[PDB]
Design a protein around this nucleic acid. Structure first.
Lengths: 248, 240
DNA sequence: GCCGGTTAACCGGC
DNA sequence: GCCGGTTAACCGGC
């Protein structure tokens, strides 16, 4: 993680910091971005801003196929790149904006290594509700592609969690948390199928005691994923079928 | 439906105006004034007219309807903690966007929006599960003629700085062929369609609709289960 | 504590 | 034309 060495720096900056009251705390992410662009400026990219960048760097490379070759990475191409029609229709006069379904919130790159940082926010006033982290399915392909292409030391997926509460007309940061996905026990990940199949947890609750290699983590997760999938399917007959079979 | 017989009306005062939530509530308020509520406004109302009772079990009986209880009501806690000084604020999880009631009959109007600019993506309408429980609750309690769930797609496009409505549709869920409904499990188990595409060729009774939908649901459930294996299992076995 | 269902929509594959 | 994943997080049952 490029952000860890100065996490403490951030915690101090964000704790206390306030924002406008109209996710709910989307402002806080901006602050986090703003901050990063000030201390790790030559590393910081909103996801789309990296695509725009890479395509300006080679204007004689047009069409999707050619543009896709510019990633040097099947895994990354899969996590970061936009559609084939979207990549086709890219131009200086037609840059990428934000995309709702996009993988990361913020991207930290340095010497071909990539940290993909999601910035999650939380209303601590209300009852804890573990948010969607990432698609269990998307993560699955990610792991598969990692294995197939030998890409084991190219990129990390990390999260920052900004805790806030309602205080008058503005909203304030009470605390934060930081964790790294590939440093958690894969088989302890909670997959909520019904919830668009998303792994779920609060960052402060994520464990960081994985011991093996990156490649072990992927196999281990794929193992857990496949296993949760086998079990989810049977559990479906009982929840959504059985209880209703009488009425028909 | 109380909306249909003035849909034409509505349609007129919407095309041309200027992700983005378009009122519609305002209008419904003016015309059929007494019969419209922004949902929670109804709850507050329902409770404000009965200050005589507190506690959640006592207040859940103010629905006099197992089935209505299920869709409109808030959890035991928030109910209990309801006072004329601590009313309900907007909650995202609320079923209806707008609620019209009359003669002890309820129309649950939902207001969808669409950007004709971007390519068509059937929006989540209602949860397949939530709908199955409803049908289940209708039957058990023979509540077949009490409520409708209808919709009102509002289409629009951007123009320099402002978004303009370019048309509106309207459909009735309980007039659609149940077996035609798309249940996209991955999308939180939601029914997916655009209103202007919802078929309306159903003619059977209400009890028949529900019975049918439970058959549809169950079928698509077994179907979804099996297909998890070939999508989420087979493809990764090779890695472990 | 433990657990999992909802809202709003929104892209892109072949 | 046809088909289905994704993002933001969110409440309340027992």
């Amino acid at each position: 993680s490029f952000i860890k060495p100065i996490y403490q720096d951030i915690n101090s900056i964000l704790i206390g910091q306030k924002v406008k009251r109209p996710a709910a705390g989307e402002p806080f992410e901006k602050l986090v971005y703003k901050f990063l662009k000030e201390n790790l400026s030559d590393l910081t990219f909103k996801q789309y801003e990296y695509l725009n960048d890479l395509f300006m760097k080679n204007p004689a490379i047009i069409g999707h196929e050619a543009r896709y070759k510019l990633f040097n990475s099947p895994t990354l191409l899969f996590l970061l790149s936009r559609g084939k029609a979207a990549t086709e229709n890219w131009s200086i006069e037609n840059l990428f904006e934000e995309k709702q379904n996009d993988t990361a919130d913020i991207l930290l790159v340095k010497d071909q290594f990539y940290e993909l940082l999601d910035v999650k926010t939380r209303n601590i006033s209300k009852s804890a509700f573990a948010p969607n982290i990432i698609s269990a399915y998307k993560l699955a392909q990610t792991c598969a592609k990692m294995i197939d292409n030998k890409e084991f030391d190219l990129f990390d997926i990390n999260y920052l969690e900004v805790d806030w509460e309602l205080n008058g007309e503005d909203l304030v940061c009470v605390s934060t948390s930081f964790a790294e996905l590939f440093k958690s026990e894969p088989s302890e990940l909670y997959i909520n199928w019904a919830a668009a199949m998303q792994i779920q947890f609060h960052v402060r609750d994520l464990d960081q005691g994985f011991n093996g290699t990156r490649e072990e983590w992927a196999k281990s997760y794929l193992k857990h994923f496949v296993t949760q999938a086998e079990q989810r399917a049977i559990s479906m007959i009982d929840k959504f079928v059985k209880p209703f079979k009488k009425y028909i």
